[PDB]
Design a protein around this ligand. Sequence first.
Ligand SMILES: Nc1ncnc2c1ncn2[C@@H]1O[C@H](CSCC[C@H](N)C(=O)O)[C@@H](O)[C@H]1O
Ligand SMILES: [K+]
Length: 265
Amino acid sequence: MLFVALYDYEARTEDDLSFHKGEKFVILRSSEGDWWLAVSLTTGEQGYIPSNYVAPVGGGTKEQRILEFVQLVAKPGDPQSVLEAIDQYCTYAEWAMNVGDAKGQIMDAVIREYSPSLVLELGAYCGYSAVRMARLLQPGARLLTMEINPDCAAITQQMLNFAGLQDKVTILNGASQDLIPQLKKKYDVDTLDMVFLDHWKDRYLPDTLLLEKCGLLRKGTVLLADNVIVPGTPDFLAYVRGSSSFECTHYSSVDGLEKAIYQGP
Ligand SMILES: Nc1ncnc2c1ncn2[C@@H]1O[C@H](CSCC[C@H](N)C(=O)O)[C@@H](O)[C@H]1O
Ligand SMILES: [K+]
């Protein structure tokens, strides 16, 4: 991750940045047996540094490494910055299953169009989408995310702490089918304005039917489902588009999001 410059270096080529010895860099990936792609801590610029000038300092899983990149590169308490850091690392360093910047354009439009006062995310992972949505909630508005994996939950918590969004989000530890019935009970929710679906692709139908059967859906509650089409959510995308209880709308960027506005029982 963290490297230091051993020698001063003026930029030659078209793709490299300049630096003084002692400047730190956080490394995105190598290229040849030389060249790294990196971010200057001094200027936040991304570019190529030659391996002859640079060496590792001492800064396990992909998930701590995304979190570590954010804490080195992004401005804390600035959600836009954190999103750009995760985007940057997951573009050039390591693929990760966050909804990207692309599908995140869609969510921004849906979140903005429908001003939810209360959102349920199913699948936090590294906290990318939680930040993406919570940065757009009106003051007072709440986000609730559900994450099985306690490991993914621990990272999501730090990622929110870093973004400054911890105060308007609440991670819930467990599987969906465990937690969804607990919702009105244990976390005083009446109905849900919006639900985001990016957890395991098969559970998109139990949980939908469960939430319905739990009353948490109201007329007008918006269901947004990631990874229809790619991976593939085939019985969800059939249940919902043929049920009179949902008006569906499809969006691309070819993967896509399905908007499913609940029209009632
Ligand atoms: N049934 C379930 N209940 C709660 N969390 C689940 C779940 N099935 C899968 N998950 C979690 O959902 C995550 C899916 S990856 C989702 C990425 C995230 N929505 C983003 O865009 O940034 C994984 O971390 C997995 O642990
Ligand atoms: K995916």
